[PDB]
Design a protein around this motif. Structure first.
Motif, PDB file in Angstrom:
ATOM      1  N   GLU C  24       0.828  -1.204   0.000  1.00 46.88           N
ATOM      2  CA  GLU C  24       0.000   0.000   0.000  1.00 46.88           C
ATOM      3  C   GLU C  24       0.863   1.254   0.000  1.00 46.88           C
ATOM      4  OE1 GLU C  24      -2.605   1.632   3.594  1.00 46.88           O
ATOM      5  OE2 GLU C  24      -3.845   0.986   1.902  1.00 46.88           O
ATOM      6  N   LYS C  25       1.770   1.362   0.973  1.00 49.59           N
ATOM      7  CA  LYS C  25       2.670   2.508   1.028  1.00 49.59           C
ATOM      8  C   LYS C  25       3.377   2.715  -0.304  1.00 49.59           C
ATOM      9  N   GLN C  26       3.844   1.629  -0.925  1.00 51.99           N
ATOM     10  CA  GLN C  26       4.474   1.752  -2.236  1.00 51.99           C
ATOM     11  C   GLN C  26       3.462   2.192  -3.287  1.00 51.99           C
ATOM     12  N   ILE C  27       2.212   1.738  -3.165  1.00 50.50           N
ATOM     13  CA  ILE C  27       1.171   2.162  -4.099  1.00 50.50           C
ATOM     14  C   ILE C  27       0.939   3.663  -3.980  1.00 50.50           C
ATOM     15  CG2 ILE C  27      -1.343   2.122  -4.391  1.00 50.50           C
ATOM     16  CD1 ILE C  27      -1.165  -0.953  -4.171  1.00 50.50           C
ATOM     17  N   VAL C  28       0.755   4.151  -2.752  1.00 48.92           N
ATOM     18  CA  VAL C  28       0.463   5.568  -2.553  1.00 48.92           C
ATOM     19  C   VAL C  28       1.628   6.423  -3.036  1.00 48.92           C
ATOM     20  CG1 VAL C  28      -0.286   7.303  -0.890  1.00 48.92           C
ATOM     21  CG2 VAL C  28      -0.971   4.923  -0.585  1.00 48.92           C
ATOM     22  N   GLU C  29       2.859   6.001  -2.739  1.00 52.25           N
ATOM     23  CA  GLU C  29       4.023   6.746  -3.206  1.00 52.25           C
ATOM     24  C   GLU C  29       4.038   6.835  -4.729  1.00 52.25           C
ATOM     25  N   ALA C  30       3.653   5.753  -5.408  1.00 52.15           N
ATOM     26  CA  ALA C  30       3.620   5.762  -6.867  1.00 52.15           C
ATOM     27  C   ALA C  30       2.609   6.777  -7.388  1.00 52.15           C
ATOM     28  CB  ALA C  30       3.290   4.366  -7.392  1.00 52.15           C
ATOM     29  N   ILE C  31       1.418   6.815  -6.786  1.00 56.99           N
ATOM     30  CA  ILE C  31       0.394   7.753  -7.239  1.00 56.99           C
ATOM     31  C   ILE C  31       0.887   9.188  -7.099  1.00 56.99           C
ATOM     32  CG2 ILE C  31      -1.861   8.702  -6.602  1.00 56.99           C
ATOM     33  CD1 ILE C  31      -2.822   5.828  -6.240  1.00 56.99           C
ATOM     34  N   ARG C  32       1.614   9.489  -6.019  1.00 60.12           N
ATOM     35  CA  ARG C  32       2.199  10.820  -5.876  1.00 60.12           C
ATOM     36  C   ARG C  32       3.192  11.101  -6.997  1.00 60.12           C
ATOM     37  NH1 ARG C  32       3.899  15.207  -2.769  1.00 60.12           N
ATOM     38  NH2 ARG C  32       2.298  14.870  -1.167  1.00 60.12           N
ATOM     39  N   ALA C  33       4.081  10.144  -7.274  1.00 61.01           N
ATOM     40  CA  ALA C  33       5.033  10.314  -8.365  1.00 61.01           C
ATOM     41  C   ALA C  33       4.314  10.610  -9.673  1.00 61.01           C
ATOM     42  CB  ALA C  33       5.905   9.067  -8.499  1.00 61.01           C
ATOM     43  N   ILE C  34       3.212   9.904  -9.936  1.00 64.10           N
ATOM     44  CA  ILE C  34       2.416  10.191 -11.124  1.00 64.10           C
ATOM     45  C   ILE C  34       1.907  11.626 -11.081  1.00 64.10           C
ATOM     46  CG2 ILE C  34       0.266   9.623 -12.328  1.00 64.10           C
ATOM     47  CD1 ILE C  34       0.791   6.691 -11.485  1.00 64.10           C
ATOM     48  N   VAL C  35       1.373  12.043  -9.931  1.00 62.81           N
ATOM     49  CA  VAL C  35       0.862  13.406  -9.794  1.00 62.81           C
ATOM     50  C   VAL C  35       1.967  14.416 -10.074  1.00 62.81           C
ATOM     51  CG1 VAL C  35      -0.035  15.091  -8.128  1.00 62.81           C
ATOM     52  CG2 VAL C  35      -1.032  12.803  -8.275  1.00 62.81           C
ATOM     53  N   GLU C  36       3.151  14.195  -9.498  1.00 70.70           N
ATOM     54  CA  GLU C  36       4.269  15.095  -9.760  1.00 70.70           C
ATOM     55  C   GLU C  36       4.639  15.097 -11.237  1.00 70.70           C
ATOM     56  OE1 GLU C  36       6.920  13.643  -6.799  1.00 70.70           O
ATOM     57  OE2 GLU C  36       5.861  14.814  -5.274  1.00 70.70           O
ATOM     58  N   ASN C  37       4.634  13.923 -11.871  1.00 71.91           N
ATOM     59  CA  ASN C  37       4.919  13.856 -13.300  1.00 71.91           C
ATOM     60  C   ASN C  37       3.851  14.592 -14.100  1.00 71.91           C
ATOM     61  OD1 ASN C  37       4.863  11.586 -15.987  1.00 71.91           O
ATOM     62  ND2 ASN C  37       6.638  12.872 -15.490  1.00 71.91           N
ATOM     63  N   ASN C  38       2.579  14.354 -13.780  1.00 73.96           N
ATOM     64  CA  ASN C  38       1.507  15.088 -14.444  1.00 73.96           C
ATOM     65  C   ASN C  38       1.660  16.590 -14.239  1.00 73.96           C
ATOM     66  OD1 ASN C  38       0.503  12.516 -15.025  1.00 73.96           O
ATOM     67  ND2 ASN C  38      -1.622  13.156 -14.683  1.00 73.96           N
ATOM     68  N   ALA C  39       2.066  17.004 -13.037  1.00 75.10           N
ATOM     69  CA  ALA C  39       2.240  18.428 -12.774  1.00 75.10           C
ATOM     70  C   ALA C  39       3.312  19.021 -13.677  1.00 75.10           C
ATOM     71  CB  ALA C  39       2.591  18.651 -11.305  1.00 75.10           C
ATOM     72  N   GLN C  40       4.411  18.291 -13.883  1.00 75.82           N
ATOM     73  CA  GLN C  40       5.449  18.753 -14.797  1.00 75.82           C
ATOM     74  C   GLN C  40       4.958  18.766 -16.238  1.00 75.82           C
ATOM     75  OE1 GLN C  40       9.423  17.033 -14.630  1.00 75.82           O
ATOM     76  NE2 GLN C  40       9.462  17.208 -12.390  1.00 75.82           N
ATOM     77  N   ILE C  41       4.093  17.819 -16.605  1.00 76.00           N
ATOM     78  CA  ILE C  41       3.556  17.788 -17.962  1.00 76.00           C
ATOM     79  C   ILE C  41       2.717  19.032 -18.229  1.00 76.00           C
ATOM     80  CG2 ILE C  41       1.916  16.593 -19.460  1.00 76.00           C
ATOM     81  CD1 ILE C  41       3.016  13.956 -18.323  1.00 76.00           C
ATOM     82  N   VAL C  42       1.836  19.382 -17.289  1.00 79.78           N
ATOM     83  CA  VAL C  42       1.011  20.576 -17.462  1.00 79.78           C
ATOM     84  C   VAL C  42       1.891  21.807 -17.625  1.00 79.78           C
ATOM     85  CG1 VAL C  42      -0.588  22.119 -16.251  1.00 79.78           C
ATOM     86  CG2 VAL C  42      -1.067  19.680 -16.397  1.00 79.78           C
ATOM     87  N   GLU C  43       2.921  21.941 -16.785  1.00 79.75           N
ATOM     88  CA  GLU C  43       3.834  23.070 -16.927  1.00 79.75           C
ATOM     89  C   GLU C  43       4.489  23.072 -18.303  1.00 79.75           C
ATOM     90  OE1 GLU C  43       4.247  25.625 -14.844  1.00 79.75           O
ATOM     91  OE2 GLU C  43       5.533  26.504 -16.397  1.00 79.75           O
TER      92      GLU C  43
END
Ligand SMILES: [Ca+2]
Ligand SMILES: [Cl-]
Lengths: 91, 91, 90
Positions: C24-43
């Protein structure tokens, strides 16, 4: 684009809501939020690519603008010659 | 672009299969699909950024076109004066 | 763009770490990484959209160039006439 930043805004919240108190349904909700955000990103990319067709249209117009300029300058070169011949004809 | 839409529709499908019958292996499935989709989105952006170099090349060409035009108009301004003097001189 | 590739590579590694031994902890960390990646994509998308305004400015400049050329060529058409009339007269 404005949709993107908001969609990203929602996405960070769901993440935050997931981070504070995990759950499986909260996980699936996050993945759904990600998919919807990715969907908006693809739509933003599609619109960019469409808008980029103007780049090609602009390049074609420049080329034709340059081709017309070259023709004008050859004429001016020949016109400059005619005048000098005209002046020296008179004197 | 076409790859993006399909990759997104693959992604939407996996989400569906995830929503109907949740599972950990199906969760990891979804995340892998997302990473693959993001990977294609990045390549799309990199290609767009590459294509945008034409914008600079177009801008440089328009500038040179305008510089050549200003020169022609200056010459034409002098040429028009030459004919005025020529005609007036003759008559 | 350099950030994006790294952001995606960081994301790929976390996935591998998640695939090594799920959690689970690894799952949640991955979703954050995706969010950070998506945030860079929008920028990245924002920056492209901002840069695209040059397309409009180029288009306007081309139109003014073409307009100026048409004026030159009409004048040249008239100037060619003047020399013809001048030469024939003299
Ligand atoms: Ca000209
Ligand atoms: Cl352009």
């Amino acid at each position: 684009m404005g949709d993107l930043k908001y969609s990203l805004e929602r996405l960070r919240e769901i993440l935050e809501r997931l981070e504070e108190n995990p759950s499986e349904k909260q996980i699936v909700e996050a993945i759904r939020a990600i998919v919807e955000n990715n969907a908006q990103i693809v739509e933003a990319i599609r619109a960019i690519v469409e808008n980029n067709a103007q780049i090609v249209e602009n390049n074609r117009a420049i080329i034709e603008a340059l081709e017309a300029i070259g023709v004008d300058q050859k004429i001016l070169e020949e016109m400059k010659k005619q005048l000098k011949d005209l002046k020296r004809s008179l004197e």
